[PDB]
Design a protein around this ligand. Structure first.
Ligand SMILES: Cc1cc(CCCOc2c(Cl)cc(C3=NCCO3)cc2Cl)on1
Ligand SMILES: Cc1cc(CCCOc2c(Cl)cc(C3=NCCO3)cc2Cl)on1
Lengths: 273, 255, 236, 40, 273, 59, 40, 57, 40, 59
């Protein structure tokens, strides 16, 4: 492939460099339309800018935490982090968010990796070996109330059991309702006068729930869960302007008030170098 | 001039005619047939009394009144005393059979009411006591009398609550079982052909009933003004393709 | 010795994975299969059998009576019953259809709603059933109702009427647990002319109503049902 | 590839792709045609 | 495959929507019999509703517990949980139970996964590493009386030895007596007047027994066993009405007295939306 | 039983590696794709559209 | 070699090697030739 | 393989059920030598009683 | 596939499918026919 | 290095499984078999030989 062809002096009536940008086109002008060039080859394919590659590496999408401790006398397991959940969403963390929001609709399978590490902030004789249980409560499913409920039975709910310190991995098909995930949605659930606005109304795919299978030892053990997400088989439509201001909320476009100028002011003139 | 409506079933030395039928159901779309060798286990040649057992026995009649809750019969129990069918039953170790069930209830074009006639394979009843109380033998072997769902709880008997099918499921879903309605305005009989359904090729006829026939009023009986407020319901049932095997001394069963 | 590398996920137990295992009983011979009528292969086979809907839900303890929709003689213009179409909740919820839908997260497809009339044979009636697609309110009078999917039913010799709620939807799947964006409409029924009883007859007549799914139907993404739970393991 | 000798040890079965609701939805003895009258 | 064909106005003598439900049939009526439709395709196969899929994921069927402690002076090992058993059955937990009871007879191979985690509720210097031994005592086999009996020799009894925290897995052929497992059984063992009623009399396939191989350390260690069961090669006959009331017992259909109405009462009229 | 040896790196999680995984939802059927104008395949496709430069940065 | 049955479980996809910026860079209704005048 | 063949009434001079155990043999008598039987197949091979299986765990 | 060189290292043997009880059930010198008299 | 994943059950010992193992005595030659009357192949062969029943159990 040639990156530049050889081109010499020109004295024409045919001027490729004068255009009318009002038309909305970006005319494909090249170095050889306005200087004299020599042949050179590309030596490159643009492999690593493919959208599959761009969205295809694992990104941290969520960090939560649960603890193993005596539940005796706990009136609210959920509240004691005897077990937590994460009303699934990929808008939490902004690193992967900005990347995704470069497009309007996106379609992909997900590969999740879940790393779990334990901490024992206060005096323990040892490090126990705990087994985590991650179960996906599809919307319209009995939500775990306790840490050893009947829900954890998950007889129809896909669940994975792995050891703390270890990692769990699997993949999920594209479980979108539509033909693709809406990165943006300028509409509402229904024609109400108070109903929410955005995608937060469209992206209601239940939540994931974690918990430690093991009973309690004499000390307490903090287990912190990190969920990583990798898109595989990516398809993206309609590019948009990149995010300039900071994010404030999962699912709304809102930016913070009295934010700071995002364009760097010159130290000098327009004329400055 | 054949209508879905008029029918004749001749089986053995007995015939039934209905002039107001609503087709007939054949459970699971299969018609009763004898036991093939490829499916056989017991090495004994079986006995097939044919026409002496495969005829129509009419059980004693019930009375549908505005307060009726529904009735339940078990097979082969209901027939335990009918003619030679019954003798064969007590005398062989094993037996197998399909049936034609014909439920009858006629009224006039001023009455309203609708019965559900359903056959439930393996209808294990629940104790009204709860917990793990069992349902004694006698209670699940009412004979031709069947069980009257509007009778009182008894001790060691089953629960008789209709909206739970006597087992913890809702009346509304009984329609997943082969069934037919008798709607006075349409229908006057219900006929269901039952093929033999079991997890073994042949079984004992006394320790295990393999279907319960259930007739349940769903739209209450409503008679014309100053009519007598009740109608009789009659059940006639015929064993079909019956086979008995392992003949001997003659079972003695509780009560 | 062949060189290997183990990946993330090694040693995990995923209740949904499908692999080979050693048999604990090497060489054992299972009992022969015999033929049994009734084999089921797909839950899609059974949700096409219709079952009764306790439409008359207004009672206070479960009763045979909540399956009966009453009809009044001589009323004109008026409304017989109304319900939204959240098949995973409300009237639908205990029906076989409702009961299976609850094992899945998403459903799509047409529903078949039929009404069987049980009044005396010498009576007559004309009813209108209307399906209102998502976007409008439950109709408030027949005029409103009749502008959407509807069937004038003429009560005759043929006892049942089968109304279909054709799949009307932007999004190709709806959630089985009730959700707004994903909502399916309303179903109402009104007198078209009116029920008329013959002489010597009196009182209310009832309609029985069934629901089953058309062959159209799709259910996906299995999950656990809210319809059953427990507090301690059972024992014998 | 089965690594094991016994059939019980193989993975899950593969979709019936059988599907025939008529034993449940139309177990009537005389065939009913849609469009023809139910009761003649 | 078409999901709907195109159909237009109709003015016929041929009415597919009038039927007689008294017959017991559900006539196959479609949208196109009563409105004007356009062609649409199914795009779907019904894969995930196959009974193999429905019953084919692991469900928790049993949680038991045993402890490692000094048996010195224990007069009843079984009673000290020096070792436990579980008179095998799949009716214990109701999540998988309701699913199975959708059918009358069921036939399948079982794949068991056994997860074992340890707990040390009171002061230990460390976490020991225990090895569990799960042996299936077929009915008519010497039942373990002690925790280091001659029975544990299991020279003819299939047994598996795995580490606590780890998982054990294997599969068992369909060991039913008949051609299929009876989900329901309206009969008795014999023509007695006091003999039990149900399947609890049919499903007598012995019990599984667990124990810790390791001797006792200075502290005590609680090991809790969870048995998961996955049906593979499923065959199911005769569908039944789903379970509506709660369960009370393994193997009987009995429901609790003064249970609550299972059908939700309307907040409003029959006419309400 | 086939003899193996594990190499350095076993058990690591590299966010950039690309391998197979079990599907949590065996047999599930995704929604059909419909056509949507605007598909992007390479970031190289979009950086050829021109956009305005805030050249007058002096504010 | 796929070891798994479902398509979601396969590795990353492979390069589009599609690449056609004209839907974005030249969505004009009447075709513009470089070198010819923009507005005639 | 048949487990039992079909066999009917017999009135013979050929009695397979009378033997002399003093000989040391176990004569191979079957159900069909003394009752009327119907055909049935074995459906079984005797796999799990092979001595390799018996001593092999 | 055997991964090992020695025969002892291979898995269990496979069913004799030999089966001949006559060395045990009928070790008589003169053949006895069922149905013929035992002692002539 | 070929990528692997280990499944649940790894490391377990099931007394009934049947796999290959290294021989501790590489290259050893077992004693030749000679003929011995009486070989048994199936327990089904022997349960067809009749034996006496202590029917008179009353002692
Ligand atoms: C965008 C976007 C993508 C997703 C993912 C949908 C939920 O996917 C999961 C499923 Cl289907 C199953 C499991 C799971 N099954 C067993 C363990 O975890 C986890 C997730 Cl995140 O949500 N919003
Ligand atoms: C229904 C139903 C299914 C079963 C299972 C039968 C028992 O199956 C087992 C066998 Cl054959 C062996 C082992 C076992 N062998 C070594 C370790 O565990 C465990 C079970 Cl559950 O019981 N009721």
């Amino acid at each position: 492939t040639v990156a530049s062809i050889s081109s010499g002096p020109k004295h024409t009536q045919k001027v490729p460099i004068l255009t009318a940008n009002e038309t909305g086109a970006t005319m494909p002008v090249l170095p050889s339309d306005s200087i004299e060039t020599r042949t050179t080859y590309m030596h490159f394919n643009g492999s690593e800018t493919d959208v599959e590659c761009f969205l295809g590496r694992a990104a941290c999408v969520h960090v939560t935490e649960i603890q193993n401790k005596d539940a005796t006398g706990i009136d609210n397991h959920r509240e004691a982090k005897l077990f937590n959940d994460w009303k699934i969403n990929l808008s939490s963390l902004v690193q992967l968010r900005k990347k995704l929001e470069l497009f309007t609709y996106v379609r992909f399978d997900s590969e999740y990796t879940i790393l779990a590490t334990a901490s024992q902030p206060d005096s323990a004789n040892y490090s126990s070996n705990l087994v985590v249980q991650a179960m996906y409560v599809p919307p319209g499913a009995p939500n775990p109330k306790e840490w050893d409920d009947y829900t954890w039975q998950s007889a129809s709910n896909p669940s994975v059991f792995f050891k703390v310190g270890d990692t769990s991995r699997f993949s999920v098909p594209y479980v979108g309702l539509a033909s693709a995930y809406n990165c943006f949605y300028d509409g509402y659930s229904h024609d109400d006068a108070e109903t929410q606005y955005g995608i937060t109304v469209l992206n209601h795919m239940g939540s994931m729930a974690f918990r430690i299978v093991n009973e309690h030892d004499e000390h307490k053990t903090l287990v912190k869960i990190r969920v990583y997400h990798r898109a595989k088989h990516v398809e993206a439509w309609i590019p948009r302007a990149p995010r300039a201001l900071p994010y404030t909320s999962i699912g709304r476009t809102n930016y913070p008030k009295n934010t700071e100028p995002v364009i760097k002011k010159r130290k000098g003139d327009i004329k400055s170098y | 001039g054949y209508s879905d409506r008029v029918q004749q079933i001749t089986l053995g030395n007995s015939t039934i005619t209905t002039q107001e039928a609503a087709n007939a159901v054949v459970c699971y779309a299969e018609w009763p047939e004898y036991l093939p060798d490829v499916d056989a286990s017991d090495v004994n040649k079986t006995s097939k009394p044919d026409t002496s057992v495969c005829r129509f026995y009419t059980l004693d009649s019930k009375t549908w009144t505005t307060g009726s809750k529904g009735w339940c019969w078990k097979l082969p129990d209901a027939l335990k005393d009918m003619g030679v069918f019954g003798q064969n039953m007590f005398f062989h170790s094993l037996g197998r059979s399909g049936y034609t069930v014909h439920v009858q209830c006629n009224a006039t074009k001023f009455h309203s009411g609708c019965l559900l006639v359903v056959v439930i394979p393996e209808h294990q009843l629940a104790s009204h006591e709860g917990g793990n109380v069992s349902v004694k033998y006698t209670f699940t072997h009412p004979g031709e009398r069947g069980i009257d769902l509007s009778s009182a709880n008894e001790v060691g008997g089953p629960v008789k609550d209709v909206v739970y099918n006597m087992n913890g499921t809702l009346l509304g879903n009984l329609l997943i079982f082969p069934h037919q309605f008798i709607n006075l305005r349409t229908n006057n009989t219900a006929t269901i052909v039952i093929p033999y359904i079991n997890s073994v090729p042949i079984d004992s006829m006394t320790r295990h009933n393999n279907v319960s026939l259930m007739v349940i009023p769903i739209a209450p009986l409503t008679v014309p003004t100053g009519a007598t407020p009740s109608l009789p319901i009659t059940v006639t049932i015929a064993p079909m393709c019956t086979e008995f095997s392992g003949i001997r001394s003659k079972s003695i069963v509780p009560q | 010795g062949l060189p290997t590398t183990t990946l993330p996920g090694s040693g995990q137990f995923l209740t949904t994975d499908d692999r080979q295992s050693p048999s604990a009983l090497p060489n054992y011979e299972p009992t022969p299969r015999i033929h049994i009528p009734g084999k089921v292969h797909n839950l899609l086979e059974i949700i096409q059998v219709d079952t009764l809907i306790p439409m008359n839900n207004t009672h206070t303890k479960d009763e045979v009576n909540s399956y009966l929709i009453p009809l009044n003689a001589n009323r004109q213009n008026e409304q017989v019953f109304g319900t939204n179409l959240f098949i995973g909740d409300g009237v639908f919820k205990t029906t076989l259809l409702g009961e299976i839908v609850q094992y899945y997260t998403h459903w799509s497809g047409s529903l078949r709603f039929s009404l069987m009339y049980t009044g005396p044979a010498l009576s007559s009636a004309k009813l209108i059933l209307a399906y209102t697609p998502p976007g409008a309110r439950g109709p408030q009078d027949r005029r409103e109702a009749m502008l959407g999917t509807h069937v004038v039913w003429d009560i005759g010799l043929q006892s049942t009427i089968v109304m279909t709620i054709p799949w009307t939807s932007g999004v190709q799947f709806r959630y089985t647990d009730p959700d707004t964006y994903t909502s399916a409409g309303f179903l109402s029924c009104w007198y078209q002319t009116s029920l008329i009883l013959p002489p010597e007859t009196t009182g209310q007549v009832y309609l029985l109503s069934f629901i089953s799914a058309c062959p159209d139907f799709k259910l996906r993404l299995m999950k656990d049902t809210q319809t059953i739970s427990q507090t301690v393991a059972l024992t014998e | 590839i089965n690594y094991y000798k016994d059939a019980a040890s193989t993975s899950s079965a593969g979709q019936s792709l059988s599907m025939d609701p008529s034993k449940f939805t139309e177990p009537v003895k005389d065939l009913m045609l849609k469009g023809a009258p139910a009761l003649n």
